Amino acid sequence: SVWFEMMRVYNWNHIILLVSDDHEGRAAQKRLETLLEERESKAEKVLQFD
Amino acid sequence: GRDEGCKLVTIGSGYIFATTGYGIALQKGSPWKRQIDLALLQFVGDGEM
């Protein structure tokens, strides 16, 4: 969310999600998409793996 | 359509004209845009419009 606040710092909009884990990564993706709904934007590509 | 005697009739149906639409003006940065747009798509999508 502070990183979403970083989208208020440098006015950056084009982001890519990369998460190694799976449990916390889904909730982080949910929170990030909830915040990106406010600017009506989305991340480019979400990534989860082993 | 309410002309007395149906005298005053336009030419064509806007073929040689601008043919624009109407909308709801929101301020640049208003978070209400997506809800209003999906509500308009719902109002057209059921014949309520």
From Swiss-Prot, chain A:
Domain of life: Eukaryota
Tissue: Detected throughout the brain, in brain cortex, cerebellum, thalamus and olfactory bulb.
Post-translational modification: NMDA is probably regulated by C-terminal phosphorylation of an isoform of NR1 by PKC. Its phosphorylated state is influenced by the formation of the NMDAR-PPP2CB complex and the NMDAR channel activity.
Swiss-Prot/TrEMBL domain comment: A hydrophobic region that gives rise to the prediction of a transmembrane span does not cross the membrane, but is part of a discontinuously helical region that dips into the membrane and is probably part of the pore and of the selectivity filter. The extracellular N-terminal domain (ATD) is a site of allosteric regulation to modulate overall receptor function.
Family assignment from sequence similarity: Belongs to the glutamate-gated ion channel (TC 1.A.10.1) family. NR1/GRIN1 subfamily.
Function, as annotated: Component of N-methyl-D-aspartate (NMDA) receptors (NMDARs) that function as heterotetrameric, ligand-gated cation channels with high calcium permeability and voltage-dependent block by Mg(2+). NMDARs participate in synaptic plasticity for learning and memory formation by contributing to the long-term potentiation (LTP). Channel activation requires binding of the neurotransmitter L-glutamate to the GluN2 subunit, glycine or D-serine binding to the GluN1 subunit, plus membrane depolarization to eliminate channel inhibition by Mg(2+).
Quaternary structure annotation from Swiss-Prot or TrEMBL: Heterotetramer; the NMDAR subunits are modular and harbor tiered domains that function in concert to regulate opening and closing of the cation-selective ion channel pore. Forms heterotetrameric channels composed of two GluN1/zeta subunits (GRIN1), and two identical GluN2/epsilon subunits (GRIN2A, GRIN2B, GRIN2C or GRIN2D) or GluN3 subunits (GRIN3A or GRIN3B) (in vitro). Can also form heterotetrameric channels that contain at least two GluN1 subunits and at least two different GluN2 subunits (or a combination of one GluN2 and one GluN3 subunits) (in vitro).
Protein name as annotated: Glutamate receptor ionotropic, NMDA 1
Residue span relative to the full protein: 149 to 198 of 938
From Swiss-Prot, chain B:
Subunit structure: Heterotetramer. Forms heterotetrameric channels composed of two GluN1/zeta subunits (GRIN1), and two identical GluN2/epsilon subunits (GRIN2A, GRIN2B, GRIN2C or GRIN2D) or GluN3 subunits (GRIN3A or GRIN3B) (in vitro). Can also form heterotetrameric channels that contain at least two GluN1 subunits and at least two different GluN2 subunits (or a combination of one GluN2 and one GluN3 subunits) (in vitro). In vivo, the subunit composition may depend on the expression levels of the different subunits. Found in a complex with GRIN1, GRIN3A and PPP2CB. Found in a complex with GRIN1 and GRIN3B.
Subcellular location: Cell projection, Dendritic spine; Cell membrane; Synapse; Postsynaptic cell membrane
Domain notes: Contains an N-terminal domain, a ligand-binding domain and a transmembrane domain. Agonist binding to the extracellular ligand-binding domains triggers channel gating. A hydrophobic region that gives rise to the prediction of a transmembrane span does not cross the membrane, but is part of a discontinuously helical region that dips into the membrane and is probably part of the pore and of the selectivity filter.
Coiled-coil region list: none
Tissues with expression: Detected in brain cortex, olfactory bulb, hippocampus including the dentate gyrus, striatum, thalamus, superior colliculus, inferior colliculus, midbrain and cerebellum (at protein level). Detected in brain cortex, hypothalamus and cerebellum.
Naturally occurring in which organism (per UniProt): Rattus norvegicus (Rat)
Organism phylogeny: Eukaryota, Metazoa, Chordata, Craniata, Vertebrata
Function: Component of N-methyl-D-aspartate (NMDA) receptors (NMDARs) that function as heterotetrameric, ligand-gated cation channels with high calcium permeability and voltage-dependent block by Mg(2+). NMDARs participate in synaptic plasticity for learning and memory formation by contributing to the slow phase of excitatory postsynaptic current, long-term synaptic potentiation, and learning.
Protein name, per record: Glutamate receptor ionotropic, NMDA 2A
Domain of life: Eukaryota
Parent sequence residues shown: 740 to 788 of 1464
